Design a protein around this nucleic acid. Structure first.
Ligand SMILES: Nc1ncnc2c1ncn2[C@@H]1O[C@H](COP(=O)(O)OP(=O)(O)O)[C@@H](O)[C@H]1O
Ligand SMILES: Nc1ncnc2c1ncn2[C@@H]1O[C@H](COP(=O)(O)OP(=O)(O)O)[C@@H](O)[C@H]1O
Ligand SMILES: [Mg+2]
Ligand SMILES: [Mg+2]
Ligand SMILES: [Zn+2]
Lengths: 362, 558
DNA sequence: GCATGCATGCGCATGCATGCAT
DNA sequence: ATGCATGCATGCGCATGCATGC
């Protein structure tokens, strides 16, 4: 693939920062990638995750989140996917045509040695309580999407071939990266034409993000500065020209910059430990936030008459309320606490506002 | 070490001094066993707890020895309780009587079997956790049956008759394979040294029923990222014909190896099976979509009912199907192509015992006389859809391929879920329910409040009418299904009219309508089901009115 | 809407190696 | 002491199911 005295460090950092914990964790997610704060927050929410609930009648409520990123080429989506693969404990990359439905889903093979039928686990079966990254999601066939639908809905796989039948657990989370049908995102056309996906598939996803490569001179200057600062960097202790744990990372003149001396980034190991500890915690929802969330859900649904000229990326269904609750639970997990507060729901509401609506240019 | 004579005496006195249950149960059991009115006796280890608990531990550690001791004790106790001769005696009883009239193995004269029931204090184990530590002990396992073998006879004691003498030789069998005898060990032949040869007899020999079965772990007990494991159980005696494929069972038995590696197996002792419109209280709304499910569960007087629900995504159709699958006693649930083709219908497979080919059925075969649930119906293959249509219309499946020529009986009721109409569904399905969603602030607020309450308190909001548990609903359905109402002759003059005008209305609305004798048959079936719900012998008008209202509501869903 | 390419189970026979019951 | 039945590949012939390309 734990320490002893870092518990004091974790307790001190939590009791000190409190509210700023989530912001600092989101900011220090990936120094090598510039911008995209909301995407980093969503990735942190995936790392934390929701709460699975089981009731008396045996009904199951999903606790995982799903995010789909769509945008122009060279906006650092594959880099984010690779970073999630590196950081997540159980992370599995499965490209579009790399694996078929038989590879993603467990299958049945008749054993010649004994004459019996045995089950061989698929890609999603192995990644229980983990992360599955799918690059080039648009290239995937329809049948694979139909197979993935059951896992995205209830996280279980039903298999049956005469003489044997079973149900396997597939409680996983999915990252997906896809390109627009026209290659580059057309500003004028509606998002429905650009995405080119059925409503059910989008609804089963929890969050949709649209990223654009706007050629603004200031943004280009900042991006070039960051890229060349990262490229000029060389690891300390290595001779020039050669071929080939503190809570806050040591400041570097190249990785951070002179201006960034006022702030520091969290170390990777401490971040991993804190993420694990937070994932252990089981928060509880309060009554104050429930009415607020319900009223804001009603406002979101009634916004059809208040959308102005902006369009909606994804339809609003009953799953959106569960997504709101799950994001609130994740944000509550971000800082070590016990109850859900108002700002906790406000953050998820802001995320939904940013994700769900987009302006259309003439 | 300990002498077995003292423990045998303790067992004998225990079998005679357990009045504390007021009738003497063991006396009656022994009387029935002596008069050949009972062929099986079960011993409760919870009953033994009143006596010295050391016997319980000893039995849990050396079960086979104590089973044999109990059998011997019961055999010795049998003569005392005898009062009369056998009223009607069969072939084996005739042989036993003739042999007694004229040493014999104990099991040859014996005609009863003894079994142990696991203590309630003994916690059931997991198939994954039974290992070398449990070899030779008594264990309890909960699982799901997947494969069962046919019933066949198995030798217990073999009887040989000599060529030149009337003496009969007896050979016990304690191995899967045995070596038949040749020479006669009788004293007459030994003295004369005639060298006669023995011949096997089927009539004098003793046979017992034998069965194989396989069990798998529940999906809840499977660890992270693993696959359920399987175990093999042997069935003999009166325990035969109890377990069937697809059932959730609990078996108490012994863990024994087979011959320095060895292969393990289980020997079974006890096998056990594991308004009213309150279906899924967790889901808000859909008041008129739940009575149809109740009528589907109750069924008609062929009287089968098939229901299809078409709806936009996010209205939670799958949860209703899962609840129906869980509630029904015999039920199967299909998600899509993961159980296509061979998953349905049947396939030919090798046998564990006979070594030949036998037919094993699919989901539809298992769901015979039950309810089947299908999700994402529109995504199924053409062959699966044709098979489903054949099941719906004819209730039998016909298979004719290389090596297979069979007609399987499948009397199952189908509930299907789908997304958005084709004429096949309207012409074939009895009831179609189209669920459409539109934004309303008050309804949205109510649904959000209910969903938040469900997520917070982990229980549906309380109301004036409390719902009911699954056991009570199952018992109520079982009680309701007993009766069979009849339609009175006079009400025909009503019902026919209620049909004709309806069709006339359908003739007025030429846009999109479908009516035939199938609608009348569905109305009659629904009316009979509603009358059965009231336990009335004669169908009443209110049932017909309710069925007509339900059909109209289904039709009015655009 | 259908024939074909690509696995995969089924049933079978055939050849090479070895381990011991009559 | 010796010859043979069996375990373990491997070719042969076949049917069956899933995907796609015109
Ligand atoms: N905002 C950014 N900050 C730093 N580097 C970037 C940024 N956007 C793109 N890049 C660089 O451009 C490359 C984009 O490649 P890739 O991540 O494969 O694009 P995509 O995932 O959109 O196909 C990366 O190697 C990355 O180093
Ligand atoms: N009327 C309702 N009452 C309560 N919860 C609902 C309702 N409709 C939808 N939901 C919630 O929305 C989710 C819908 O998911 P799912 O059942 O997979 O939808 P579908 O079955 O339509 O694909 C469920 O988890 C359920 O908790
Ligand atoms: Mg990329
Ligand atoms: Mg569904
Ligand atoms: Zn003789």
């Amino acid at each position: 693939s734990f320490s002893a005295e870092d518990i004091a460090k974790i307790k001190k950092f939590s009791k000190t920062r409190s509210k700023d914990i989530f912001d600092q964790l989101a900011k220090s997610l990936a120094p090598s990638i510039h911008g995209h704060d909301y995407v980093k927050k969503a990735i942190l929410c995936l790392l934390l995750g929701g709460v699975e609930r089981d009731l008396e009648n045996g009904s199951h409520i999903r606790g995982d989140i799903n995010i789909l990123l769509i945008g122009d080429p060279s906006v650092a989506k594959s880099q984010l996917l690779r970073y999630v693969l590196c950081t997540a404990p159980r992370a599995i990359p499965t490209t579009g045509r790399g694996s078929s439905g038989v590879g993603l889903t467990a299958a049945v093979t008749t054993d010649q040695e004994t004459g019996e039928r045995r089950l061989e686990a698929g890609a999603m079966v192995l990644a229980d309580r983990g992360v599955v990254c799918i690059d080039e999601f648009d290239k995937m066939s329809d049948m694979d999407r139909t197979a993935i639908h059951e896992v995205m809905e209830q996280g279980r796989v039903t298999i049956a071939k005469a003489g044997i039948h079973a149900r396997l657990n597939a409680r996983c989370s999915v990252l997906a990266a896809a390109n627009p049908v026209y290659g580059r995102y057309d500003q004028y056309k509606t998002p429905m034409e650009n995405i080119g996906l059925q409503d059910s598939l989008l609804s089963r996803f929890d969050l949709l993000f649209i990223m654009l490569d706007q050629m603004d001179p200031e943004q280009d200057r900042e991006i070039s500065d960051h890229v060349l600062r990262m490229h000029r960097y060389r690891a300390p202790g290595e001779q020039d020209g050669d071929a080939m744990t503190q809570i806050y990372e040591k400041h570097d003149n190249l990785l951070h910059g002179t201006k960034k001396k006022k702030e520091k980034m969290v170390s990777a190991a401490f971040m991993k430990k804190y993420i694990h500890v937070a994932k252990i915690i089981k928060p509880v929802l309060t009554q104050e936030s429930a009415t607020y969330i319900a009223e804001e859900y009603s406002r979101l649904r009634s916004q059809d008459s208040m959308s102005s000229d902006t369009a909606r990326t994804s339809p609003v269904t009953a799953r959106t309320l569960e997504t709101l609750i799950r994001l609130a639970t994740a944000h509550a997990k971000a800082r070590m606490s016990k109850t859900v507060d108002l700002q906790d729901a406000e953050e998820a509401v802001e995320l939904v506002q940013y994700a769900y609506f987009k302006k259309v240019l003439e | 070490l300990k002498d077995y004579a003292l423990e045998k005496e303790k067992v004998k006195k225990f079998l005679q001094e357990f009045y504390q249950d007021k009738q003497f149960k063991y006396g009656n059991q022994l009387v029935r066993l002596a008069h050949r009115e009972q062929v099986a006796l079960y011993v409760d280890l919870d009953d033994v707890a009143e006596d010295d608990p050391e016997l319980v531990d000893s039995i849990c550690e050396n079960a086979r020895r104590y089973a044999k001791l109990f059998a011997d004790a019961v055999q010795e106790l049998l003569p005392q309780y005898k009062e009369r001769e056998v009223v009607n005696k069969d072939v084996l009883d005739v042989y036993i009587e003739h042999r007694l009239m004229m040493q014999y193995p104990a099991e040859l004269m014996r005609r009863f079997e003894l079994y142990f029931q696991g203590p309630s204090s003994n916690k059931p184990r997991v198939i994954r956790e039974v290992r070398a530590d449990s070899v030779g002990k008594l264990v309890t396992v909960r699982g799901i049956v997947t494969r069962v073998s046919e019933v066949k006879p198995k030798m217990v004691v073999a009887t040989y008759t000599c060529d030149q003498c009337g003496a009969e030789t007896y050979q016990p069998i304690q191995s899967p394979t045995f070596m038949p005898l040749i020479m006669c060990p009788s004293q007459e032949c030994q003295t004369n040294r005639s060298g006669g040869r023995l011949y096997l007899q089927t009539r004098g020999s003793r046979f017992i029923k034998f069965q194989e079965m396989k069990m798998q772990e529940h999906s809840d007990q499977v660890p992270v990222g693993n696959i359920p494991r399987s175990i093999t159980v042997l069935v003999e005696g009166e325990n035969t014909r109890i377990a069937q494929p697809g059932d959730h069972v609990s078996v108490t038995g012994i863990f024994l190896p087979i011959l320095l590696l060895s292969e393990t197996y289980l020997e079974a002792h006890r096998i056990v099976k594991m308004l009213a419109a309150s279906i899924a209280p967790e889901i808000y709304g859909h008041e008129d979509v739940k009575k149809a499910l109740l009528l589907l569960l109750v069924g008609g007087v062929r009287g089968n009912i098939n229901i299809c629900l078409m709806g936009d995504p996010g209205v939670a159709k799958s949860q209703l199907l899962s609840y129906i699958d869980r509630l029904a006693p015999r039920s199967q649930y299909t998600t899509g192509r993961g159980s296509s083709g061979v998953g349905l219908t049947a396939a030919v497979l090798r046998d564990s015992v006979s070594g030949e080919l036998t037919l094993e059925g699919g989901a539809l075969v298992l769901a015979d006389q039950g309810v089947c649930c299908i999700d994402e119906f529109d995504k199924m293959a053409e062959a699966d859809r044709t098979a489903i249509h054949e099941v719906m219309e004819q209730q039998t499946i016909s298979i004719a391929k290389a090596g297979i020529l069979t007609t399987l009986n499948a009397r199952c009721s189908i509930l299907a879920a789908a997304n958005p109409l084709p004429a096949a569904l309207l012409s074939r399905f009895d009831l179609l329910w189209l669920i459409q969603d539109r934004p309303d602030r008050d309804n949205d607020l109510r649904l959000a409040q209910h969903i938040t309450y469900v997520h917070q308190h982990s229980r549906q909001p309380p109301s004036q009418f409390e719902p009911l548990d699954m056991k009570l609903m199952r018992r109520y359905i079982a009680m309701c299904r007993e009766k069979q109402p009849m339609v009175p002759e006079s009400l025909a003059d009503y019902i026919t009219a209620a049909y004709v005008e309806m069709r006339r209305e359908a003739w007025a609305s030429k846009d999109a309508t479908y009516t035939s004798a199938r609608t009348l048959l569905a109305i009659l079936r629904l009316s009979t089901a509603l009358a059965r719900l009231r336990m009335v012998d004669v169908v009443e008008k209110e049932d017909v009115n309710e069925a007509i209202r339900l059909m109209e509501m289904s039709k009015d869903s655009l």
